[PDB]
Design a protein around this ligand. Structure first.
Ligand SMILES: C[C@H](NC(=O)C1CC1)c1cccnc1
Length: 182
């Protein structure tokens, strides 16, 4: 509808796949080469389904901060025959607050879904499903089951992936450029 939705659509149309684990179907953001991200609660194993194709997992790492606190981001390297467009230059370098974000989801349950969530707060600490979690972004939208993995964007930046909600607020794990250096 506007330039925020334009940036979101551009990311969804080239840098997302549908990931299926034994814990459900997730929006999965591809970042570069065969490297993608997914919420750690997806419990990625040795095999994952990518757009309904059986795919070997070459590496999976559940990220934690240097205090050994959960970040709720798993970085997955896929045995896929195709690379993602490199979008690392759209990742923030530092923790921040944002205006006017969009949450975008693409699954069997919610295809081509875009939600203007408004202002995004650097919330920090969250007890997420009983797990102490750091680097949480918060937005005041009543997000629902089916939205985990959804991509949070502003104009020009890919800032997070949706990891939970409390019925009134939604919560995303930050994406930082430093997670994807090689
Ligand atoms: C304007 C456009 N932006 C995107 O693709 C956003 C979705 C990432 C673009 C065009 C040419 C080179 N870089 C970027």
């Amino acid at each position: 509808m506007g330039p925020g939705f334009d940036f979101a659509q551009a990311i969804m149309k080239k840098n997302t796949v549908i990931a299926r684990t034994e814990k459900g179907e997730f929006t999965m953001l591809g970042v570069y080469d065969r490297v993608a991200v997914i919420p750690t609660h997806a419990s990625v194993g040795e095999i994952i389904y990518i757009n309904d194709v059986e795919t070997r997992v070459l590496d999976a790492c559940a990220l934690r901060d240097l205090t050994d606190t959960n970040l709720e981001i798993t970085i997955v390297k896929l045995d896929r025959n195709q690379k993602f467009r490199d979008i690392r230059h759209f990742l923030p370098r530092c923790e921040d607050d944002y205006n006017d974000a969009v949450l975008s989801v693409h699954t069997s349950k919610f295809p081509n879904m875009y939600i203007p969530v408004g202002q995004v707060t650097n919330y920090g600490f969250l007890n997420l499903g009983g797990t102490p979690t750091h680097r949480i972004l918060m937005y005041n939208f009543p997000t629902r089951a089916g939205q985990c993995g959804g991509v949070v964007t502003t104009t020009g930046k890919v800032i997070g992936i949706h990891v939970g909600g409390n019925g009134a607020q939604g919560f995303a794990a930050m994406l930082l450029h430093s997670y994807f250096t090689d």
